[PDB]
Amino acid sequence: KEDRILKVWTVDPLVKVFRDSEPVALAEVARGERATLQIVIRCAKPIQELHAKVGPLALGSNAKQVLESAPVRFVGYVPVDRPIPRPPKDQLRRPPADFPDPLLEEKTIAVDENQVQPIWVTVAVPTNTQPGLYQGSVHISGRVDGRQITTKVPVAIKVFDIEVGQSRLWVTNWFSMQSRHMKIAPEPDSQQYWALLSRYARNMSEHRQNVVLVSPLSLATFQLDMEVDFSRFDRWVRIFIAEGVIGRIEGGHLGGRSSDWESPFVVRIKELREGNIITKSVAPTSEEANQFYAQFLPALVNHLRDRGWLEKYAQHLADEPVRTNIESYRAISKLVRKYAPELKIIEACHTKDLAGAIDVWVPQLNFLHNDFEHYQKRQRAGDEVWFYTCIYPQGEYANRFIEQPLLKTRLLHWINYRYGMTGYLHWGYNQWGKDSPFTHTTKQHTGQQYLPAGDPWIVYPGRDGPLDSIRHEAMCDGIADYELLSMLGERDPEAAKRLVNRHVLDFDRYNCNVEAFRATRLELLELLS
């Protein structure tokens, strides 16, 4: 006894806890938000069978009014072996190091001696929850050198009388339908395939994603005697509607680069060749491109209109146009404008010189900063402007890299509010490679640069569906923050400016002080309640 005492403390969930962190639970939320509590343990001896149970979280005026807690999850660690090449000053530690990120879904875990272990508690608070102060405890148990150890940790959730429903922010995370590294491996069109697709869709809507990228080329079949069959595309759309994502439908890219970074764009077509439908890439000004798109685009518009989906849809042309391939990009736009004038066009862009060619602009964050007057004008002209991050920007800009403070993920959506950008895009929902994402955090193809840890995936492969990361949680919370700030700004625009300006000081400069952030959140909640 003494070496068996369990050290327990509570840490703000915006603070990343490392295996060697030193010791230091209340959450404050609107109805409609998710409350997170992070409870951290350490023991001088190994622990077997660590388990936590959330007791009833009850209203003091009425023990009958209880919040429903999700199953408890354990914070998992991943080896970040190589760093962001241009890191921020506030980089949490220098690689190589083990960082907290995946939220594991295990009933029990082992802890090695002297290793700090976070326990992550999520309480989703429905909009119809009665406001007030909910209290209870988390019962932690396990076995240390024979003996059963146990402790209860007091926790409290204050539920403010303000309702956050759907966030008006548009959010897309590009998703690949794949079961790599899972304990299941469904084939396409199997029941389990569609069940997994549903589980992914639910995970996305539970994290306030309300846009999904679906390809009308890849998920259609063609007969070319043209007849287009959209039945697989439709199954996807109905799943994403039913699980509460759609929202909007983001049509997959029609084309891409012919070769290298500055090469011209080509567009995919379908052709009948020797009895088979083949796909090939052609110049957008070609007769082959004109013949295909003159039939495919009207078929797509008719289909969407007939299904009541046309006003929810926007079509991608080709990703990340730059100044040197602008002509071929615009030639793709001309095809769409000609055969499908009713279709809205969306693009993740670098070049700004696309007025009339696209309707939903998605500049990379640093390009938005640099070309801000351009993008404000496009909004005045009636276009939508969102933004993205990826491998870039690095430096001091906000992003969702594992090396960054977790507030840099959450404050992405404060950048949306401050600057009036009405959506956010990211390529990297679940782009796992052939190596495990748990043990190989810096994805890399041979002869090209590695991706910083955090960039290609924000969820991890569980046994039969996605596991969240702590960054997925922070992203969801930021999307709810944007809705709160938007509700405030309708009543009191000056108070919403003051609050956002506390944390978003410029495009590339923030206040990530977690205590300051909590005091801002509380003022927001108090002003709105």
PDB file of C-alpha atoms in Angstrom, residues 29 33-37 54 57 67-70 121-126 157:
ATOM      1  CA  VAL A  29     -22.797  23.853 -22.373  1.00  0.00           C
ATOM      2  CA  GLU A  33     -24.076  20.650 -27.336  1.00  0.00           C
ATOM      3  CA  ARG A  34     -21.693  17.859 -26.333  1.00  0.00           C
ATOM      4  CA  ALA A  35     -20.061  17.999 -22.880  1.00  0.00           C
ATOM      5  CA  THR A  36     -16.645  16.388 -22.532  1.00  0.00           C
ATOM      6  CA  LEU A  37     -14.865  15.521 -19.213  1.00  0.00           C
ATOM      7  CA  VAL A  54     -20.484   7.171 -15.250  1.00  0.00           C
ATOM      8  CA  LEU A  57     -25.879  12.770 -13.718  1.00  0.00           C
ATOM      9  CA  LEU A  67     -28.426  13.251 -18.681  1.00  0.00           C
ATOM     10  CA  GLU A  68     -27.514  10.236 -20.793  1.00  0.00           C
ATOM     11  CA  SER A  69     -23.745   9.552 -21.046  1.00  0.00           C
ATOM     12  CA  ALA A  70     -22.101   7.709 -23.917  1.00  0.00           C
ATOM     13  CA  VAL A 121     -16.323  11.047 -21.037  1.00  0.00           C
ATOM     14  CA  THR A 122     -18.843  12.355 -23.585  1.00  0.00           C
ATOM     15  CA  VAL A 123     -22.314  13.527 -22.665  1.00  0.00           C
ATOM     16  CA  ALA A 124     -24.435  14.568 -25.645  1.00  0.00           C
ATOM     17  CA  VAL A 125     -27.014  17.067 -24.307  1.00  0.00           C
ATOM     18  CA  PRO A 126     -30.290  17.019 -26.407  1.00  0.00           C
ATOM     19  CA  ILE A 157     -22.379  19.771 -16.179  1.00  0.00           C
TER      20      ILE A 157
END
